[PDB]
């Protein structure tokens, strides 16, 4: 029952995070594409501050299909030994209609239930 | 009388190239933004193969304002001693709602009158 968040929303690409806990938080990302063309060779990257550790598991695919017909999911495991408020930077890269696109964002809006 | 081209059109950012010649082609770029937020700290970069030479002059500003309320203009002077078909790789970087965005494209649709 940890609230989800929108980690990223710009110009047609949205990424939601959902959370599970059993010092580790397991994040599942869901990437979706509201534009008229597929985002191909899609790669998600994440980094946490040095006082946390992250493990990124394999994504479901490398294509975010046009017009919300499907998603990419991917799991991130975050270790938080010092019990600090979660913080993360993400980087997205993909191809779209002959263009190569990259974007980076800070994710700050983690809910307290995701870490405290 | 040289036809203009759309050098770049993706996801709300459009860049037109217009041309003048008096082996030098003077390109004026026009960047516009049909999205709901300004594209700030906007930087245009261009590269050409080695058998050309480019001089990039200063842009009119560093903001492409939201909802098509204005443009950035910037001049590129290209020298083409071998009179080969003109082509270019461009890279754009900017901030959008705080996210850092980068995009790259090849511009290989130059009109014959821009180089022949």
Curated annotation (Swiss-Prot), chains A, B:
Q: Would you say which domain of life the source belongs to? A: Eukaryota
Relate the outcome reported for changing residue 47 to D.
Strongly reduces interaction with EPS15 and SYNRG
Name the consequence of residue 56 to E: Strongly reduces interaction with EPS15 and SYNRG
- What tissues has this protein been observed in? Widely expressed.
Function of the molecule? Subunit of clathrin-associated adaptor protein complex 1 that plays a role in protein sorting in the late-Golgi/trans-Golgi network (TGN) and/or endosomes. The AP complexes mediate both the recruitment of clathrin to membranes and the recognition of sorting signals within the cytosolic tails of transmembrane cargo molecules.
According to the record's subunit comment, the protein's assembly and interactions are: Adaptor protein complex 1 (AP-1) is a heterotetramer composed of two large adaptins (gamma-type subunit AP1G1 and beta-type subunit AP1B1), a medium adaptin (mu-type subunit AP1M1 or AP1M2) and a small adaptin (sigma-type subunit AP1S1 or AP1S2 or AP1S3). Interacts (via GAE domain) with RABEP1. Interacts with EPS15. Interacts with SYNRG/gamma-synergin. Interacts (via GAE domain) with AP1AR (via coiled-coil domain). Interacts with CLN3 (via dileucine motif); this interaction facilitates lysosomal targeting.
Question: Which protein is depicted?
Answer: AP-1 complex subunit gamma-1
Species source reads: Mus musculus
The protein's gene is named: Ap1g1
Q: Specify first residue, last residue and whole-protein length for the fragment.
A: 704 to 822 of 822
